[PDB]
Amino acid sequence: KQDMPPVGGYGPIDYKRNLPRRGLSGYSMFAVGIGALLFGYWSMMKWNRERRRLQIEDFEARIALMP
Amino acid sequence: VSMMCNEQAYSLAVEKLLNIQPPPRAQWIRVLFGEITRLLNHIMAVTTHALDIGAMTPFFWMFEEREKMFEFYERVSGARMHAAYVRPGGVHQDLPLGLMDDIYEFS
């Protein structure tokens, strides 16, 4: 008399197949790429030109002496 | 791999000769384990293919879940894999108390 089949309690689990967790698509990408890229170029011309100012300063001490 | 899909092709190849239909509780178990060995080939048929190819991690990510299934084989018949379980006279013996809130827990 002690056999298995239970009265209730069932799901089931799915046979489904989906995980569309997107994801900033469709022209939202290529937008964070370009602006941060020119931001790095914007970081230039305030350092290389600044080091160029120090570069003439470095060559200044050479020319002032040597007579 | 197959432990209940083999011997399914043998008792059903013998019971036709002997003019026997198997009893109805027994037929619900041959479909249950006969539709559980396909969840052993179709795991091994992808991972071992994905090892020749050379991927490491889907070999270990699925056999660690496969261990939750050999506990069934040991609980019902006799051993780890190779079970003389299906007979020509239907099922050998009844599966014990349990294995119905386990499979539903597993699946």
- What is the DSSP secondary-structure string of chain B? --SSSTTHHHHTTTTTTTT-PPPHHHHHHHHHHHTTTHHHHHHHHHHTHHHHTT--HHHHHHHHHHHHHHHHHHHHTSSSS----EETTEESS---S-SSTTHHHH-
- Spatial separation of the C-alpha atoms in residues A16 and B56, rounded to whole Å: 27
Q: Are B101 and A8 in contact (CB under 8 A)?
A: no
Residue A66 sits at φ, ψ, to 5 deg, of 60, 50
Residue B102 sits at φ, ψ, to 5 deg, of -100, -50
Helix H or strand E encompassing A49: helix A48-64
C-alpha Rg value of chain A to the nearest Å: 34
Residue A3: strand pairing partners: none
8 Å CB contact of A6 and B107: no
- Using the structure block, give the residue that is written with the tokens 């994801």: A23
Residue B3 CB-density burial (10 A; 0-12 exposed, 13-18 middle, 19+ buried): buried
**B99 contact A CB<8A:** yes
Residues 64-83 of B with CB under 8 A from A: none
Cis before A33? omega within 30: no
8 Å CB contact of A4 and B95: yes
How far does CA B32 lie from the centroid of its chain? 8
| Residues in A touching B94 (Cβ below 8 Å) | 3
Q: Are B73 and B83 in contact (CB under 8 A)?
A: yes
- Spatial separation of the C-alpha atoms in residues A46 and B64, rounded to whole Å: 57
Q: How far A4 CA lies from chain B's nearest CA (Å)?
A: 7
| Method used experimentally | cryo-EM
- B65, B77, B13, B73: which is closest to B37 by C-alpha? B73
What is the CB neighbour count within 10 angstroms for residue B63? 12
Residue B33 CB-density burial (10 A; 0-12 exposed, 13-18 middle, 19+ buried): buried
Q: Are B83 and B77 in contact (CB under 8 A)?
A: yes
Question: For A28, how many CA atoms within 13 A lie in the half-sphere containing its CB?
Answer: 5
8 Å CB contact of A2 and B97: yes
